[PDB]
Specification:
Distance between the termini of chain C: 67 Å
Strand content of chain C: under 5%
Number of strands of chain C: 0
Oligomer: part of a larger assembly
Chains: A mainly alpha (about 70), B mainly alpha (about 120), C mainly alpha (about 45), D mainly alpha (about 475)
Helix content of chain B: 55-70%
Structural class of chain C: mainly alpha
Largest sheet of chain B: none
Shape of chain C: rod-shaped
Structural class of chain B: mainly alpha
Protein name (chain A): Mediator of RNA polymerase II transcription subunit 9
Strand content of chain B: under 5%
GO biological process, one term (chain A): positive regulation of transcription elongation by RNA polymerase II
Radius of gyration of chain B: 15 Å
Family (chain A): Belongs to the Mediator complex subunit 9 family.
Largest sheet of chain C: none
Organism (chain A): Homo sapiens (Human)
GO molecular function (chain A): transcription coregulator activity
Shape of chain B: globular
Radius of gyration of chain C: 20 Å
Order of helices and strands of chain B: HHHHHHH
């Protein structure tokens, strides 16, 4: 972050508690980033999402093909 | 007829300019008829050249006048009708080489070849 | 002025990639929840 | 070759949540030690206050008297570079010449033009020539613009025969993001829009152009201090008689990019118009064409070695070819070709120089166009084609090309002299017994307009050949 380093340099070479505010902002940003939910890397997550989308499409197509061909008596 | 392709091959590339003697001796029967030697090549090349000194050839001319048919060279530089053109650039080199050619002496021809060379000069 | 600059560039790139990965994970989770709901409804109807 | 100093040993050798007491208890104490503040262009984008702070920092470090009310705006401490977008000499100018190129997000014309003019307008003068003579030369550099407009009005046919070629007139304004320049290069056979399609005159920025400058150290020649001659002249232009003239410590030293080879006659003729010749040093009288071809083709040349060794093999319209250069060959003229391998362009005041530069410019352009055929083509042992020719520069600007004409069983030379600036002489000499393989004045003028050795080779191999 550019603003954190700027506030740190200001509080260091001005002659307030910019370091505490910078640490608090960094902790809040880390918490917001971890708030997403995806613990593992997003690569395998996207791979599994694509696989699930393909499976859902295949299941929908199979259900449509099964419910379409209804000519028995 | 071989003289045409010979001079073509000669001018076509920038050879060592001393290996020319070896290349000629190899490509030529080496004694068939020397009346088709460089003697006329200079003039037949400078004709189309006109206002050009035609370098890289005067070296061949020198390596020839070192030991070749001086009589043919003499008669051909004599009959060369360059006064009408008057380039004053090629004829300059011609008179320069003729000076050192006639300076020391002529050679023996064991015949009236000397008288012919005299008429030529 | 090369090591610190490269470190800052790598940190900015890592932050941008993390934000993009979080957005993609959220979108993928939403799409997966929708697909799971659709598949569950279809499976209940089929059952 | 490792990364053990990022998160493994960097945080462990920094000598948390309650250990930030280093702002008031340990504070009892930009070039190569503190790179954090110096890297403002990397931490934040180039904005108005960032550049204004960087300028102030550079002025405080290197030494330059300049200040303002606060941070957010900063001018340029110079003769007339003081201009704030969006009084000790000239007034505050807000012209578009220094507002167009640097309008919103430009970052090129901010540390080069200023530093350039600072280094140029710097000398041992103390308040006598650093400012006075600088402003005098800047104000005097305005008759050329009036002369440019007069030439544009007079030459109301096309900006091809008078602006670039023939004579001067392809000038532009010298202010801010654009300095003084001229039409040094005159390559007409380049990649055009397929005589360029333009609405008005070019500012010598769209593409490639030379860079003219005005500096000097000892060329304090008599010159005006203000523009006087500004009326429209009779036909082309008029001189500006000075002397209201003092020893202005300045000159018109341009920036000659490449050491273009010229003739001794041109330098001797120009050595009587502006004092001394265009160079005061040991003349490098080496093979002119040899070094000139390499200097010209050095732009496109890559780090791979060429090792041509006086070989000018090149391509052809539909095959390969070859050629020579006759470099380092003393012709019947006696001494070798005079070389001008120098970069000194220290000129003098604009006196009688209406054609002192255009002649040498056309000479150098013809010399460059001669060796144009050999730029990046490297193909030897080409059995087919190989239209070898040797440009024999016996006389100044006198070339010759030999080709195996089918008319005779030998080469065919042709005197190629640059009579005019773009209309060169392309006569030829045939033989007493030779077919009509020699074209007329039509193909001669075509080759003159082309001005390319490879173009002439292809024409001989295709049009003049007819076989």
């Amino acid at each position: 972050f550019l603003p954190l380093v700027h506030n740190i340099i200001k509080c260091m070479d001005k002659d307030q508690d910019l370091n505490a505010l910078k640490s608090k902002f960094q902790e809040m940003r880390k918490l917001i980033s971890t708030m997403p939910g995806i613990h593992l890397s997003p690569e395998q997550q996207q791979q599994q999402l694509q696989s699930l989308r393909e499976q859902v499409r295949t299941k929908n197509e199979l259900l449509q093909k099964y419910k379409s061909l209804c000519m028995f008596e | 007829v071989n003289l045409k392709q010979a001079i073509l091959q000669a001018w076509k590339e920038r050879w060592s300019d001393y290996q020319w003697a070896i290349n000629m001796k190899k490509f030529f029967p080496k004694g068939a008829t020397w009346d088709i030697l460089n003697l006329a090549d200079a003039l037949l090349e400078q004709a189309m050249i006109g206002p050009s000194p035609n370098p890289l050839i005067l070296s061949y001319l020198k390596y020839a006048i070192s030991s070749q048919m001086v009589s043919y060279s003499s008669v051909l530089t004599a009959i060369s009708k360059f006064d009408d053109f008057s380039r004053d650039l090629c004829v300059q080199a011609l008179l320069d080489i003729m000076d050192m050619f006639c300076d020391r002496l002529s050679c023996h021809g064991k015949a009236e070849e000397c008288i012919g060379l005299c008429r030529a000069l | 002025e090369n090591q610190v600059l490269e470190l800052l560039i790598h940190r900015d790139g890592e932050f941008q990639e993390l934000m993009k990965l979080a957005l993609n994970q959220g979108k993928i989770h939403h799409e997966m929840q929708v697909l799971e709901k659709e598949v569950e409804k279809r499976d209940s109807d089929i059952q | 070759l490792s990364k053990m100093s990022s998160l493994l040993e960097r945080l462990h050798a920094k000598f948390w949540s309650e250990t930030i007491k280093l702002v008031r208890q340990v504070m009892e104490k930009q070039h190569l030690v503190s790179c954090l503040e110096t890297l403002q262009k990397a931490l934040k984008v180039t904005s108005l206050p960032a550049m204004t702070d960087r300028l102030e920092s550079i002025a405080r470090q290197n030494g330059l008297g300049s200040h303002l009310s606060a941070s957010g705006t900063e001018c340029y401490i110079t003769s007339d570079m003081f201009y704030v977008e969006v009084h000790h000499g000239e007034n505050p100018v807000s012209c578009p010449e220094l507002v167009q190129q640097l309008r919103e997000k430009n970052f090129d014309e901010f540390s080069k033009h200023l530093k350039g003019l600072v280094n140029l307008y710097n000398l041992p003068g103390d308040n006598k020539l650093k400012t006075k003579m600088y402003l005098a030369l800047q104000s005097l550099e305005q008759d050329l613009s009036k002369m440019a407009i007069m030439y544009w009005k007079a030459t109301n046919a096309g900006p091809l025969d008078k602006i670039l070629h023939g004579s001067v007139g392809y000038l532009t304004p010298r202010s801010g993001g654009h300095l003084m320049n001229l039409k040094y290069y005159v390559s007409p056979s380049d990649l055009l829009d397929d005589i360029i399609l333009h609405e008005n005159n070019v500012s010598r920025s769209l593409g490639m152009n030379a860079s003219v400058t005005i500096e000097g150290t000892s060329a304090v020649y008599k010159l005006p201090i203000a523009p006087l001659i500004m009326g429209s002249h009779p036909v082309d232009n008029k001189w500006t008689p000075s002397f209201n003239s003092v020893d202005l410590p300045a000159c018109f030293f341009l920036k000659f990019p490449q050491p273009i080879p010229v003739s001794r006659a041109f330098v001797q003729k120009l050595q009587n118009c502006t004092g001394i010749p265009l160079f005061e040093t040991q003349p490098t009288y080496a093979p002119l064409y040899e070094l000139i071809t390499q200097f010209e083709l050095s732009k496109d040349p890559d780090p791979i070695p060429l090792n041509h060794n006086m070989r000018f093999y090149a391509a052809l319209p539909g095959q390969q070819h070859c050629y020579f250069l006759n470099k380092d060959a003393p012709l019947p003229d006696g001494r070798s070709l005079q070389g001008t391998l120098v970069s000194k362009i220290t000129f003098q005041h604009p006196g009688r120089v209406p054609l002192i530069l255009n002649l040498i410019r056309h000479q150098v352009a013809y010399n460059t166009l001669i060796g144009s055929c050999v730029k990046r083509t490297i193909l030897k042992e080409d059995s087919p084609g190989l239209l070898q020719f040797e440009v024999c520069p016996l006389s100044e600007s006198r070339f010759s090309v030999s080709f195996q004409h089918p008319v005779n069983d030998s080469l065919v030379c042709v005197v190629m002299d640059v009579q005019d600036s773009t209309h060169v002489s392309c006569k030829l000499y045939k033989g007493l017994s030779d077919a009509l393989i020699c074209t007329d004045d039509f193909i001669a003028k075509v080759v003159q307009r082309c001005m390319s050795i490879p173009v002439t080779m292809r024409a001989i191999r295709r049009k003049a050949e007819t076989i």
